[PDB]
């Protein structure tokens, strides 16, 4: 406890930090899914080809 | 409590913070819907073309 959080508060912070990261990642995944439908990236070596 | 508030104010401020955030977002959603009607973004790879 070099910072000042108790063991329980460390457990509490970690639990909601994990799900906040998960929700943020999940929203980003759908955003990338939608962005891919609008305009895909990673073209073939010959180009996008329309 | 490094903030200086008890647990009573925490849920009080949070509840008001969330509902204010909802009002701000819903208004922004309506603004973007009107903005899309006036001038849509996200063109096709071939352009807008009206």
């Amino acid at each position: 406890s070099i910072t000042g959080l108790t063991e329980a508060e460390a457990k509490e912070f970690h639990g909601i930090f994990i799900t906040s990261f998960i929700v943020f990642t999940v929203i980003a995944i759908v955003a990338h899914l939608l962005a891919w439908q609008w305009r895909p990236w990673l073209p073939a070596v010959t180009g996008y080809g329309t | 409590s490094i903030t200086g508030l008890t647990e009573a104010e925490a849920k009080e401020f949070h509840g008001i913070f969330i509902t204010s955030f909802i009002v701000f977002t819903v208004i922004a959603i309506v603004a973007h819907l009107l903005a899309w009607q006036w001038r849509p973004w996200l063109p096709a790879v071939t352009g807008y073309g009206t």
């Binding site: 929700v23 943020f24 929203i27 759908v30 955003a31 939608l34 439908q37 | 955030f21 973007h32 899309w36």
Partner: peptide, 22 residues
């Protein structure tokens, strides 16, 4: 494609509320 912006705006908003009611 109104849905492309629809998620990136609305979902983080509904994400905070659903996250804050666990």
């Amino acid at each position: 494609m109104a849905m492309v912006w629809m998620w990136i705006l609305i979902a983080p908003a509904i994400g905070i509320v659903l996250l804050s009611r666990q």
